[PDB]
Design a binder for these strands. Structure first.
Ligand code: CA
Ligand code: CA
Ligand code: CA
Lengths: 161, 161
DNA sequence: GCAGAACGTCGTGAGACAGTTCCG
DNA sequence: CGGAACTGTCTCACGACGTTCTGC
């Protein structure tokens, strides 16, 4: 299993060269809420250091997708979805510092999702947490995320709520 | 006073946003050899995250120097010298992965320095290890450090060897 | 005489997604 | 569908010193 010092290290490395983010994906094919909330954490590194990503991958149960080269000589390792994150984030959270908040927001989103997936009003509250996470990843002088505001208007205009 | 997971986290963070390097500092007022092999590890972070550095600083016995702004919106924390590094690195080496080689090469330099101090020939050998550490911090397609070649030419030309 | 503390910065190595394609 | 896997990349956030100031 993942030992304490391994999780501590990964958390430190994630606080350094990694990212914890959420996004709203337009889904034209979806049926009433034409969006899918995507959740993920990733580690990024110069391609020559790809082996170290592979090592973290193994320690995390081989969950996620490794990419030897994004195309710009950079390599990355991304773990998408509640399935993997529900198991991984709990192991890292006690050690995360810089990105600890973002991690908790993702976990919050994961627990709210089942009942928000087909309920416009609950979906909006969940979208507010998505904006929070995107803003936590922005400098203070950057335009804040406005997914909640935009979807609230969309939902009203469509009668959904 | 550093717990395993505390050291592992720091190691992971350093592997992420830190640096472990060695360099030659020209010393106009030195008496046989006019240079000093300076050693250090540093943590770098966007100014707005300075407080996380202040925390690591405290966890490492408050050794080193904290800069809220290098002058470009970037903050950093630098630990210079064998005195501090001879205590700090041994604690981090067990958990460093990416910069592990650099930490050990610095520890090596620390153990050879006393004798290389006033021995041009030994000083050069030690400088070779400085070049190794600088090379470790380069891509494979970059110019390899020339501290050894340039110092040797200076020493011969100055009749020191 | 010796060395750490500060300062300054070119050259990127990252981040944080946006899109688009793939799969049970 | 419902969601994950793969592609792609704009905008910085770093790095790893070279150089100069301070201290005993
Ligand atoms: Ca970083
Ligand atoms: Ca890095
Ligand atoms: Ca970084």
């Amino acid at each position: 299993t993942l030992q304490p010092t391994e999780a501590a290290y990964i958390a430190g490395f994630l606080d350094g060269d990694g990212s914890i983010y959420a996004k709203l994906i337009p889904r034209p094919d979806y049926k009433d809420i034409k969006y899918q909330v995507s959740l993920a954490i990733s580690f990024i590194q110069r391609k020559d250091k790809f082996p170290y990503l592979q090592d973290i991958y193994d320690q995390l149960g081989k969950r996620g997708n490794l990419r030897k080269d994004r195309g710009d000589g950079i390599a990355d390792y991304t773990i998408i979805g509640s399935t993997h994150l529900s198991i991984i984030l709990p192991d890292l959270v006690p050690y995360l510092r810089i990105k600890k908040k973002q991690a908790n927001r993702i976990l919050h989103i994961i627990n709210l999702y089942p009942q928000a997936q087909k309920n416009p009003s609950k979906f909006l509250d969940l979208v507010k947490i998505v904006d929070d996470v995107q803003n936590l990843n922005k400098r203070a002088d950057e335009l804040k995320s406005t997914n909640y505001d935009r979807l609230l208007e969309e939902f009203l205009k469509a009668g959904k709520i």
